[PDB]
Symmetry: D2
Subunit: 243 residues, 4 copies
């Protein structure tokens, strides 16, 4: 049973590869770094049971994954943009940066999803889990460009699900905040940053960052299809920070 995970070295990627591999999936992985054959080999060495794709185009990931299996059971569309770009303000930000924000967080997942429909429908269904952000639903003053691009992909999930769910193709969005992960909250900064630790005590009812295995537990539960009627919505992964 195979899963496709995008941007595997970033954001919720490590968590998704870990939990899905432990669940018995063969995890086929995309990452910008995988254009390099050497980085492909190191990744597979460091992550038993994975396959690293060379393909970089969003519309070609599905065809490239289908080289290593009969069908795709789960796609984790783990879209991200490197820090500090997520905090780019409205004023003075270049048009290139504006377009890149939508390219990485809205156009890339659309082109992926579009390419996926036909093969996934032929296999009788699958799950597509988009990793977005809390600002997909709740706005933040310092994310005035990141927020809009994330909200587009949340709306993509809720609208596209109205039609794809009848094909057995189940779409979901996760909107993390205060989630322990290499892109926005690496374990290295927690101990050194007492403003963060005070921010979490103030704003996160759970009182801690969410753990990689808890993100992994949500992903594997969704991939199992055992609760299919919750298809088509946004799940906050924020320790109670949202709503």
């Amino acid at each position: 049973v195979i899963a496709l995970v995008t941007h595997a070295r970033h954001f919720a990627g490590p968590a998704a590869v870990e939990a899905l591999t432990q669940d018995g999936y063969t995890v086929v992985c995309h990452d910008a770094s995988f254009a390099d054959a050497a980085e492909r080999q190191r990744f597979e060495s460091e992550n038993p049971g994975t396959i690293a794709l060379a393909e970089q185009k969003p519309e070609r990931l599905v065809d490239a994954t289908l080289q290593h299996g009969e069908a795709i059971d789960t796609i984790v569309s783990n879209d991200y943009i490197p820090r500090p770009m997520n905090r780019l303000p409205l004023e003075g930000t270049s048009e290139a940066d504006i377009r890149q924000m939508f390219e990485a967080l809205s156009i890339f997942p659309i082109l992926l999803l579009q390419s996926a429909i036909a093969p996934l429908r032929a296999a009788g269904g699958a799950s597509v889990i988009f990793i977005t952000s809390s600002v997909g639903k709740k706005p933040l003053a310092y994310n005035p460009l990141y927020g809009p691009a994330r909200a587009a992909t949340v709306a993509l999930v809720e609208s596209a699900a109205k039609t794809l769910s009848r094909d057995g193709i189940l779409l979901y969005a996760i909107g993390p905040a205060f989630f322990n992960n290499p892109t926005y909250f690496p374990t290295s900064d927690w101990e050194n940053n007492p403003e963060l630790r005070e921010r979490v005590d103030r704003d996160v009812p759970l009182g801690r960052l969410g753990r990689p295995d808890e993100m992994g537990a949500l992903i594997t539960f969704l991939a199992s299809r055992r609760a299919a009627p919750i298809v088509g919505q946004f799940f906050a992964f924020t320790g109670g920070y949202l709503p």
Copy 2:
């Protein structure tokens, strides 16, 4: 492991009981019919692993449950109003029916919750899962009193989670629609009533009622605490009808 499930014979009750007992729980059950001791003996014999309480007051259920075990791991607050009161209109409805709507759907879960905080905190945490309705978030023309009462309890979950999550007491709301259950979508309606399958085809992207085991899968997933960061929010169980 102890679970308390309220109104066990109705709504989400049977689904919860089947799945929690299958996951190794001892399920302590409340139900109006359990005033009669013979009902209590029959329910227990038909459902291995369950203990039927005689207690009927919402604020005494926790104490009565703690007569059978050291701590409660999960409370399923499975509140409901007999069909067809869920469709009571605004005009011509008695003040007494209006108050009963809030009593069963809004006051009762609050008195339950308030009684549970001290013992659940002292035990190190628990999960408290409120079964509400889709109209807890999205209004429907025929539910102008049922909706308000359900929305209150969804707001209870979202607000009370801000303080209780720090005690390890994890609250959630499930808002079902088109969920195959004896109160609102019994199998008999699916078989007998031509209009229901027509409605589901038009309005439910999944194209079917939600199964009891699928509701059960969600309840036992939440009760495990493996994805604790999703605390404090509303989950649609509608097959894509919401949002």
Copy 3:
């Protein structure tokens, strides 16, 4: 052209009376203090163009108002609870206080609305404007009972609008926060409470409390029926604190 404002002395009452009287309305006012006849004549003397009702039951205010005119053009359902109670916690709170929360903020507005439909329909339509709270839509840690009660009435507006709009009976909910009013944010508090000014600088994009005349401007605009297609929704009145 007559308007009915409830709890005229508190919350959004003074703003409503002032703006509506300025817009040419004869403002019939309900208030608990009006059970004392001296207070009725003091109120009418201090507020030219008002009528202070003796009536206190919600379901009788409409008939009491039609003693002074042939139709009600606008109802401002200005429900409130005396200040400290909006912060009532779950733990240790008496059943009586819980029930009074719902009585003032959820049952009283329903019983008023129920009583108004037939005369309002007979008169070709009207506007009913419910003054609720920001916590009707966005939860807050310190409002776990006030929140539920307010959310019930916002959902009442959203549900009841689905039928009553066809009668020309236009329902709206306004949800204030940081609104300069005698109940929650008197001008006294702004000068006396440096914490309030810091909190407003931090959390309110507008940077200031909303003015009574701005709340009046919202009310009179809704009462005009000039933008009727926005019927049946919740308007944040928070200086950008919501969403």
Copy 4:
């Protein structure tokens, strides 16, 4: 006293021009046809008190508008995509069409808003009114691309308002559905399409198309800034179809 209205000949453009001019504004108008000198002269002569711009690039509209007055009081960002591109499906749709959807509905408004910030702040504030769509908040099965692009601009309003409000720059999003307008619901469609009249009867509580003067009343009310604390939110203009 000047306003800028974009795509003046489409969507909410005619409503905004007529109402703003009736209200005493000099309305500077952008439109794709205004590249034709003869179309500019004809529009100006058919619409007394307007000024037609030749400029077509979003980030130059403001400076071109400022050629005619010292300050802009209101900007109506009236963004649209020609029918029936709003119904573009996921499958088979070209990459260029996906990109054009975001260009017209998401990137164009962002580049306009960015260019406006500095001169609007120097004038001590202004109103910026984005005309989006009901699908910016509520998904629809047949708008899986139009929805995401609209949702991004709604999220832009909600996020950008967190900072721009302190400058007196007040942002709002209006989300029409069943709004009588030349692009999506011209009067002739109401006459030629009994399916449309039945859909409105079934789904729109108000029971009719929203009128252009009602959209103009909402725009003109927002432009007055008289109820500034409602800044930074989405207004349904749907006749109760939403929420």
